Design a protein around this ligand. Structure first.
Ligand SMILES: Nc1ncnc2c1ncn2[C@@H]1O[C@H](COP(=O)(O)OP(=O)(O)NP(=O)(O)O)[C@@H](O)[C@H]1O
Length: 327
C-alpha cells in the first residue's frame, strides 16, 4: 500500500526532471562487442572506478533520425531513468556526445524468452505461471504509474542470471491516465480495442498477458494466420480454442484475460489486478516471494577480444543536437 505511493513519488520526481549525462565514455574500459542493435553496437564495458561490468548500447544519432525512431528512443530513455522494479532492465547511466547516445544498461548474461520457448516448444503450467506472475507484478507496477506497456511478447523478455524475467523494450510504452489511440505492437499480441480503432487504455496489457500465457503453455499463440488481416479478424470476431492439455483453471483465467470486451476483462474490473492474483490458476503463487525473487527459477541460462576490433570514432562536430536535446 504505502510502498506504491513511495514508488509513485520516486518515479514522478525522475519523470518530470530526468537525469542527463550521468557518466562519460572515458569512465569505461571498452572490453568487446556483445552484439548489434538497430542503431549501433552493444559493448561490454568495465566502469574504471567501481570495476562493474555493463552493456553499453551505442546509438548513432544520425541512424536513429534516418529510421524515424527519435520519439521512441527518447521515450524509452525517459521511462528507463524513472522506473525501478525487479523485472525491468536497469539503465545505470546515460550520456550523449557529438555522434552517439549511450544507454549503459545492467549486464545480463541470460537468454531470451523467445529462443528458450522456441527451443523447448512449450512450458509446463507451473513454469508458465512462474513467468506470468512476474509480468502480473510488472503490469501492476507500470499501471500504478499510468504507464501502458503495449508491446508484450516473448521477444521483449530476457531471462536473467537467476532465471527471472526482465522486460527489455519501452519505445512504445506511454504515460497516460486514461485512453490513447496510437496503433502499435505486433499483430499476434494486438488487443481487439486497438484493432477496433476507437481508442484503448491500460487493459490492452491484460489482453497481451492472456496471449503470452496461452503461447507459453501451448507453444503457439491463440491467434495466427499467414496474413495480418486474418489475425485481426480472429482477435475481434473469433473464438480461441484451448488445447486439451490446458487445465480447467488455465482455460478459465484465459477466458477472462482473452475477453474481447475490455469492460469484462480481468485486470480492468473494480478489484483490478486482484482478480488475476486471486484466480485459482495462481493459487500456488507466493506473490511476495516472486517479487523478492526468492522462488527457485525453473531454467538457469548457461552464460576474448572482438574477432575484428572496431574503435568508436566520435565526431568533432555535433550531429542532430536539437532532436536529442532531452536525452
Ligand atoms: N543488458 C545486456 N546485457 C548483455 N548483453 C546485452 C544486453 N543488452 C543487449 N545485449 C546484447 O546485445 C545484442 C543486441 O542488443 P539489443 O538490445 O538486443 O538490440 P536492440 O537495438 O535493443 N534490438 P533487438 O536486437 O531486436 O533486441 C543482444 O542480442 C545481446 O547479445
Amino acid at each position: 500500500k504505502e510502498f506504491l505511493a513511495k514508488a509513485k513519488e520516486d518515479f514522478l520526481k525522475k519523470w518530470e526532471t530526468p537525469s542527463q549525462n550521468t557518466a562519460q565514455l572515458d569512465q569505461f574500459d571498452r572490453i568487446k562487442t556483445l552484439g548489434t542493435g538497430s542503431f549501433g553496437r552493444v559493448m561490454l564495458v568495465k566502469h574504471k572506478e567501481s570495476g562493474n561490468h555493463y552493456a553499453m548500447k551505442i546509438l548513432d544519432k544520425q541512424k536513429v533520425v534516418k529510421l524515424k525512431q527519435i520519439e521512441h528512443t527518447l521515450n524509452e530513455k525517459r521511462i528507463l531513468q524513472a522506473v525501478n522494479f525487479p523485472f525491468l532492465v536497469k539503465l545505470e547511466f546515460s550520456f550523449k556526445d557529438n555522434s552517439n547516445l549511450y544507454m549503459v544498461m545492467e549486464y545480463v548474461a541470460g537468454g531470451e524468452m523467445f529462443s528458450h520457448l522456441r527451443r523447448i516448444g512449450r512450458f509446463s503450467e507451473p513454469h508458465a505461471r512462474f513467468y506470468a506472475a512476474q509480468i502480473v507484478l510488472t503490469f501492476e507496477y507500470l499501471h500504478s504509474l499510468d504507464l501502458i506497456y503495449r508491446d508484450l511478447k516473448p521477444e521483449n523478455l530476457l531471462i536473467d542470471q537467476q532465471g527471472y524475467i526482465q522486460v527489455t523494450d519501452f519505445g512504445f510504452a506511454k504515460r497516460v491516465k486514461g485512453r490513447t489511440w496510437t496503433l502499435c505492437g505486433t499483430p499476434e499480441y494486438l488487443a481487439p480495442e486497438i484493432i477496433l480503432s476507437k481508442g484503448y487504455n491500460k487493459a490492452v496489457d491484460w489482453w497481451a498477458l492472456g496471449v503470452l500465457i496461452y503461447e507459453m503453455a501451448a507453444g503457439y499463440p491463440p491467434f495466427f494466420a499467414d496474413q495480418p488481416i486474418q489475425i485481426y479478424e480472429k482477435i475481434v470476431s473469433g473464438k480461441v480454442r484451448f488445447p486439451s492439455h490446458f487445465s480447467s483453471d488455465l482455460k478459465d483465467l484465459l477466458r477472462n484475460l482473452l475477453q474481447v470486451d475490455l469492460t469484462k476483462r480481468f485486470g480492468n474490473l473494480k478489484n483490478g489486478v486482484n482478480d488475476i492474483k486471486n484466480h485459482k490458476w495462481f493459487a500456488t503463487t507466493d506473490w511476495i516471494a516472486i517479487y523478492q525473487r526468492k522462488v527457485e527459477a525453473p531454467f538457469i541460462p548457461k552464460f576474448f577480444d572482438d574477432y575484428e576490433e572496431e574503435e568508436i570514432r566520435v565526431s568533432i562536430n555535433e550531429k542532430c543536437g536539437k532532436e536529442f536535446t532531452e536525452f
